[PDB]
Design a protein around this ligand. Sequence first.
Ligand SMILES: Nc1nc2c(ncn2[C@@H]2O[C@H](COP(=O)(O)OP(=O)(O)OP(O)(O)=S)[C@@H](O)[C@H]2O)c(=O)[nH]1
Ligand SMILES: Nc1nc2c(ncn2[C@@H]2O[C@H](COP(=O)(O)OP(=O)(O)OP(O)(O)=S)[C@@H](O)[C@H]2O)c(=O)[nH]1
Ligand SMILES: Nc1nc2c(ncn2[C@@H]2O[C@H](COP(=O)(O)OP(=O)(O)OP(O)(O)=S)[C@@H](O)[C@H]2O)c(=O)[nH]1
Ligand SMILES: Nc1nc2c(ncn2[C@@H]2O[C@H](COP(=O)(O)OP(=O)(O)OP(O)(O)=S)[C@@H](O)[C@H]2O)c(=O)[nH]1
Ligand SMILES: Nc1nc2c(ncn2[C@@H]2O[C@H](COP(=O)(O)OP(=O)(O)OP(O)(O)=S)[C@@H](O)[C@H]2O)c(=O)[nH]1
Ligand SMILES: Nc1nc2c(ncn2[C@@H]2O[C@H](COP(=O)(O)OP(=O)(O)OP(O)(O)=S)[C@@H](O)[C@H]2O)c(=O)[nH]1
Ligand SMILES: Nc1nc2c(ncn2[C@@H]2O[C@H](COP(=O)(O)OP(=O)(O)OP(O)(O)=S)[C@@H](O)[C@H]2O)c(=O)[nH]1
Ligand SMILES: [Mg+2]
Ligand SMILES: [Mg+2]
Ligand SMILES: [Mg+2]
Ligand SMILES: [Mg+2]
Ligand SMILES: [Mg+2]
Ligand SMILES: [Mg+2]
Ligand SMILES: [Mg+2]
Lengths: 163, 163, 163, 163, 163, 163, 163
Amino acid sequence: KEMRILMVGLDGAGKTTVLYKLKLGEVITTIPTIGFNVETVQYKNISFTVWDVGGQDRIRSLWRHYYRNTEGVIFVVDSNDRSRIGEAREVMQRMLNEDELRNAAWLVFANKQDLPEAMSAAEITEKLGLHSIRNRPWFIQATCATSGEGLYEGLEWLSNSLK
Amino acid sequence: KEMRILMVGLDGAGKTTVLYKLKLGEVITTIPTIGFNVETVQYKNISFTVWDVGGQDRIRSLWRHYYRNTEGVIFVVDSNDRSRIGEAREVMQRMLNEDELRNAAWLVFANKQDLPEAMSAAEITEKLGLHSIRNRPWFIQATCATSGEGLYEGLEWLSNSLK
Amino acid sequence: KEMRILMVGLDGAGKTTVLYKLKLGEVITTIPTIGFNVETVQYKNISFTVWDVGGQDRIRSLWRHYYRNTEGVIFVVDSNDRSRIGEAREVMQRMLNEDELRNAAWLVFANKQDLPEAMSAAEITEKLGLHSIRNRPWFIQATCATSGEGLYEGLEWLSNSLK
Amino acid sequence: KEMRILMVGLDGAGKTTVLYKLKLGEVITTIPTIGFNVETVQYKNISFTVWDVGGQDRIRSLWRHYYRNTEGVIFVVDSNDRSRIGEAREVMQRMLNEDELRNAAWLVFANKQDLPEAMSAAEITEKLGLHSIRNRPWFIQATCATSGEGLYEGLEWLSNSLK
Amino acid sequence: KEMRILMVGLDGAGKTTVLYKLKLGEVITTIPTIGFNVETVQYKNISFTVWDVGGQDRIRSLWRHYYRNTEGVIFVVDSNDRSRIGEAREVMQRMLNEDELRNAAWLVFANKQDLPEAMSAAEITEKLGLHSIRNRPWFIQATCATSGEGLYEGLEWLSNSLK
Amino acid sequence: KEMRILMVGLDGAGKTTVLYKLKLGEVITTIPTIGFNVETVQYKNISFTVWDVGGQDRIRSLWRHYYRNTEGVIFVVDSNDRSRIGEAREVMQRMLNEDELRNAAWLVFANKQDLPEAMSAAEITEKLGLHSIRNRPWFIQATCATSGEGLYEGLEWLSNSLK
Amino acid sequence: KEMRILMVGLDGAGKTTVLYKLKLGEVITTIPTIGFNVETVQYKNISFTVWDVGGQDRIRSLWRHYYRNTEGVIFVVDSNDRSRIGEAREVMQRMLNEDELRNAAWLVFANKQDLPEAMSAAEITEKLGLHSIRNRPWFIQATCATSGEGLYEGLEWLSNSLK
Ligand SMILES: Nc1nc2c(ncn2[C@@H]2O[C@H](COP(=O)(O)OP(=O)(O)OP(O)(O)=S)[C@@H](O)[C@H]2O)c(=O)[nH]1
Ligand SMILES: Nc1nc2c(ncn2[C@@H]2O[C@H](COP(=O)(O)OP(=O)(O)OP(O)(O)=S)[C@@H](O)[C@H]2O)c(=O)[nH]1
Ligand SMILES: Nc1nc2c(ncn2[C@@H]2O[C@H](COP(=O)(O)OP(=O)(O)OP(O)(O)=S)[C@@H](O)[C@H]2O)c(=O)[nH]1
Ligand SMILES: Nc1nc2c(ncn2[C@@H]2O[C@H](COP(=O)(O)OP(=O)(O)OP(O)(O)=S)[C@@H](O)[C@H]2O)c(=O)[nH]1
Ligand SMILES: Nc1nc2c(ncn2[C@@H]2O[C@H](COP(=O)(O)OP(=O)(O)OP(O)(O)=S)[C@@H](O)[C@H]2O)c(=O)[nH]1
Ligand SMILES: Nc1nc2c(ncn2[C@@H]2O[C@H](COP(=O)(O)OP(=O)(O)OP(O)(O)=S)[C@@H](O)[C@H]2O)c(=O)[nH]1
Ligand SMILES: Nc1nc2c(ncn2[C@@H]2O[C@H](COP(=O)(O)OP(=O)(O)OP(O)(O)=S)[C@@H](O)[C@H]2O)c(=O)[nH]1
Ligand SMILES: [Mg+2]
Ligand SMILES: [Mg+2]
Ligand SMILES: [Mg+2]
Ligand SMILES: [Mg+2]
Ligand SMILES: [Mg+2]
Ligand SMILES: [Mg+2]
Ligand SMILES: [Mg+2]
C-alpha cells in the first residue's frame, strides 16, 4: 500500500533519469541535483515514494538526513564508468554499516547498459562485493533508463519486501 | 526452546560458512573474522544462538569472553589441512580444561570433505585424541558446508543435550 | 489412559521401523537415529508415548536422560545378527541395574523373524539371560516390523502393567 | 546409601579403565594417571565414590593422603604381568599394616583375564598371600574391564560391608 | 552501547585524518592539533567517542589528562617515517607503563601504506616491540586514511573488548 | 581452591615463557627478568598463583623474600645447557636446606627438550641428585614451553599436594 | 605502595636529568643544583619519592640531612669522566659506612653510555669496589638519561626491596 525508497549513487549515474522515466515515462533533460527530488509512483497497487538526491562529493555528506524510515535503497552505478567503480564500492560499504538502514532492502541498478563498453551485472556484482552482504536482502538488475529496460523489474523485486 | 552455542576452530576452517549456510541456506563470500558474528537458527522447535569467532592467533586469546553460559561448542577442523592438525589438538585440549566450559557438549565438524585429499573422521578422531574425553559428551560429524552435508545432523545431536 | 515407553536396542535392530509401523501403518525408509523420535499411539483406550533413540555407540551413553518417569521399556534385538547378541546382553544387564528403571516393565522384540537365519525367541531368551530377571516383570515376543506381526501383541502385554 | 572406595595397584593394572567402565559403560583411551580421578557410581541404591590414583613409583608415596575415611579398597593386579606379582605383594602387605585402613574391606580385581597367558585367581590368591589376612574381610574376583566381566560382582560384594 | 577511545601518536601520523574519515567520510585538509578534537562515531550499534590529541613534543606531556576512564587506545604510526620509529617506541613503552591505562585495549594503525616506501605491519610489529606486551590485549592493522582501508577493521576489533 | 607457587631456576631456563604459556597460551617475546612477575592460572578448579623471578646472579640473592608461605616450587632447568647443570645443583641443594621451604613440594621442569642435544629427564635426575631428597615430595617432568608439552602435567601433579 | 629514594653522585653526573626524564619524559635544560629537588613518580603501582641533591663539594656535606628514613639510594656516576672515578669511590665508601643508610638498597646508574669513550658497567663495578659490598643489596645498570635507556629498569629493581 505504501513504501519509501532512497535512490543514491555517484554523480552521472542516472538517478534523476530513472525517477522521471518511472514517473512520467519520458526522458527529460537534466541538471545536476544540488538539492533533492521526491516523487510518488504507483505500481502493483503499491505507491513507492522515491527520494532522488545528489551525488556530488559535497552532497554525499547530506544523505544521512534521509536514511531514517527508509524501507528500500536503490544504488545506481554507471557501468561505462569503470574508473569510479572503487569509489562506489567505498560509498556502498560505508552506507551498509549505518544502523538507520539496518533493515533496508538493497537494489542495484547497473545503468547505461546500452553503451558498447558497458560492464556486465556479474562483473559489477564481483567488483562491488555484493556477495559479502549477509545482514540484508539484495538484488542487482541491468537497466537502460533511456529505454526503460529493467526499471519496472526493480520495483517488482522491491515489492517482495513489502511491510 | 533455547540453546547457546560457540563455534570455534582455527583460521580457514569453515565456521562463518557453516553459520551462514545454516541461517541463510546459501554459500556467501567471506572475509576474515576479526570480531564476531552471532545468529539465531531454528530447528526442531529449538532456537540455537550461534556465536562464530575469529581463529587468527590474535583473536584466539579473546575466546574466553564467550565461554560463560555456553551450552554447546562446535569445533570446526579443516580436513585438507593435515599440517595444522596438531595445533588444533593443542587448542582443543587447552579449551577442554577450562572450568567455564565444564558441562558444555562437544561437537566436531570435520569440514572440507568434498576435497580429494580430505582425511576421514576416524583419522581425525585419532589425531585429535577425542576418545581421551571423559568428563564430557562428544561427537564428530563429517561435513561439507558448501553443500550443507552433515550440518543439520550436528544440530540434531546438540538437541540431545537440551536443558 | 496414559503410559510412557522407551524403545532401545543396538543399531540396526528395528526400533524406528517398529515405531512408525505402529503409528502410521506403513514401512518407511530410515536414516540412522542420531537424536530421538517421539510418537503417541492409541490402542485399547490407552495412549502410549514411545521414545525411540539411537543405538550407535556414541548415543548409548545418552539414554540416561530418558530413564526417568519411564513406565515400560522395549528392547529390540536383531535375530539375524547372531554375532552381537553378547553386546546386547551387556547393554541390557547394565540397564537393568539402573535405579531409575526400577519398576519398569520389560518387553523384548526379537525382530527380523522373516529372515531365514533368524534365531528363535527361546534361543534369545537363553542367550540374553532373561530368566535371571527377578525384580521385574518381563516378556519376549517374536516380530516382523515389515509385516506388523507381533507388534500389537506387545502393546497388549504392556497394558497388563498399567497404572 | 553411601560408601567410599580407593582403587589402587601398580602401573598398567586397569584402575582407570575399570572406573570408567563402571561410570560410563565404554572403554576409554587412557593416559598415565599422574594426579587422581574421582567418580560416583550408583548400584543397588548405593552411591560408591571411587578414587583412582596413580601407580607410578613416584605417586605410590602419595596414596597416604587418601587412606583416611576410606571404607573399601580395590587392589587391581595385572594377571599377565607375572614378573611384578612380588612388587604388588610388597605394596599390599605394606598397605595392610597402616592403621588408617584398619577396618577397610579388601577386594582384589585380578584383571586382564582375557589374555591367554593370564594367571588364575587361585594362583594369585597364593602368590599374594591373601589367606594370611586375619584382621580384615577380603575377596578376590576375576575381571576383564574391557568386557565388564566381574566388575559389577565386586561392587556387589562391597555392599556386604555397608555402614 | 558506548566506548571511549584515545587516538595518539607522533606528529604527522594521521590521527585527525583517521578521525574525520570515520566521522564524515571525506578527507579534510588539516592543521596541526594544538588542542584536542573529540567526535562520536556509531558502528555495530556501538558509539565510540574518540579523542584525537596533539603529537608535538609540547603536547605529548598533556596526554595524561585523558588517560582516565579510557577503554581503548589507538596508536597511529607513520610507516614512511622510518627515522622516528624509535621515538614512537619510546613513547609507547612509556605509556604502556602508566597505571591509568592498565586495562586499556591497544590498537596500532600503521598508516600511510599507500606510499611506496611504506614498511610492513610485521616490520613495525618487530620494531615497536609489540610481542613484548603481556598485560594487555593488542592488535595491529595496516591502513590508508585517505582511502579508508583498514579503518573500519580497527573499530571492529575494539568491539571485542566491549564492556 | 588456592595454591601458591614459586618458579625459579638459572638464567635462560624458561620460567617466564612457561608462565605466559600457561596464562595466555601463546609464546611471548621475553626480556630478562630483573624484578618479578606474578600471575594466577586456573586448572582443575584450583587457582595457582605463580611468582616468576630472576635468575641472574644478582637476583638469586633476593629469592628469600618469596620463600615464605610458598606451597610449591618449580625449578626450571635448561637441558641443552649441559655446562651449568652443576651450578643448578648447587642452587637447588642450597634452597632445599632453607627452613621456610620445609614443607614445599618440589617439581622440576627439564625444559628445552625440543632441542636435539637435550638431555633426558633421567640424566638430569642423576646429575641433580634428586633421589637424595628425603624430607620432601618431588617430581620431574620433561617439557617444551614453546609447544606446551609437559606443562599441564606439572600443575596436575602439584594438585596432589593441595591443602 | 610507597618508597623513598635518594639520588646522589658527583657534579655533572646526570641526577636532575634522570629525575625529570622519569617524571616528565622530556630532557630539560639544567642549572647546577644548589638546593634540592623532590618529585614523585608512579610505576608498577608504586609511588617512588625521589630526592635529587647537589654534588658540588659544598653541598656534599649536607646530604646527611636526607639519609634518615631513606629506603633506597641511586648513585649516578659519569662514565666519560674517567678522572673522577676515584673521588666517587671515596664518596660511596664513606656513605656506605653511615648507620642511617644501614638497610638502604644500593643502585648505581652508570650514565652517559651514549658517549664513545664511555666505560663499561663491569669496568665501573671493578673501579668502584662494588663486590666488596656485603651488608647491603646492590645493582648496577647502564643508562642514557637523554634517551631513557636503563632508567625504568632501575626502578624495576628497586621494587624487589619493597616494604
Ligand atoms: N547514453 C545513455 N545515457 C544515460 C543513461 N542513463 C542515464 N543517462 C544519461 O547520463 C547523464 C547523467 O544522468 P543524470 O540522471 O542527470 O545524473 P544523476 O544520477 O542525477 O547525478 P547528478 O544529478 O548528481 S549529475 C544524463 O545526460 C542522462 O541522460 C543510459 O542508459 N544511456
Ligand atoms: N572447497 C571447499 N571450501 C570450503 C568448505 N567449507 C568452507 N570452505 C571455504 O574455505 C574458505 C574459508 O572459510 P571461512 O568460513 O571464511 O573461514 P573461517 O572459519 O571463518 O576462519 P576465519 O574467519 O578466521 S578466515 C572459504 O573460502 C570457504 O568458502 C568446503 O567444504 N569445501
Ligand atoms: N528384512 C527385514 N528388515 C527389517 C526388519 N525390521 C527392521 N528392518 C530393516 O532393517 C534396517 C534397520 O532398521 P532401523 O529401524 O532403521 O534401525 P534402528 O533400530 O532405528 O537403529 P539406528 O536408527 O541406530 S540405525 C532397516 O533397513 C529396516 O527397514 C524385518 O523384520 N525384516
Ligand atoms: N587386553 C586388555 N587390556 C586391558 C584390560 N584391562 C585394562 N587394560 C588395558 O591395559 C592398559 C593399561 O590400563 P590403565 O587403566 O590405563 O592403567 P592404570 O591402572 O590406570 O595405571 P596408570 O594410570 O598409572 S598407567 C590400557 O591400555 C588398558 O586399556 C584387559 O582386561 N584386557
Ligand atoms: N599520502 C598520504 N597522506 C596521509 C595519509 N594519512 C594521513 N595523511 C596525510 O599526512 C598529513 C598529516 O596528517 P595529520 O592528520 O594532519 O597529522 P596528525 O596525526 O593530526 O598530527 P598533528 O595534528 O600533531 S600535525 C596530512 O597532510 C594528511 O593528509 C596516507 O595514508 N597517505
Ligand atoms: N628453542 C627453545 N627455546 C625456549 C624453550 N623454552 C624457553 N625457550 C627460549 O629460551 C629463551 C629464554 O627463555 P626466558 O623465559 O626468557 O628465560 P628466563 O627463565 O625468564 O630467565 P631470565 O628472565 O633471567 S633471562 C627465550 O628466548 C625462550 O623463548 C624451548 O623449549 N625451546
Ligand atoms: N651527552 C649526554 N649528556 C648527559 C647525559 N646524561 C646527562 N647529561 C648531560 O650532562 C649535563 C649534566 O647533567 P646534570 O643533571 O645537570 O648534572 P647533576 O647530576 O644534576 O649535578 P649538578 O646539579 O650538581 S651540576 C647536562 O648538560 C646533561 O644534560 C647523557 O647520557 N649523554
Ligand atoms: Mg540527479
Ligand atoms: Mg570466520
Ligand atoms: Mg532408529
Ligand atoms: Mg590410571
Ligand atoms: Mg592532528
Ligand atoms: Mg624470566
Ligand atoms: Mg642536579
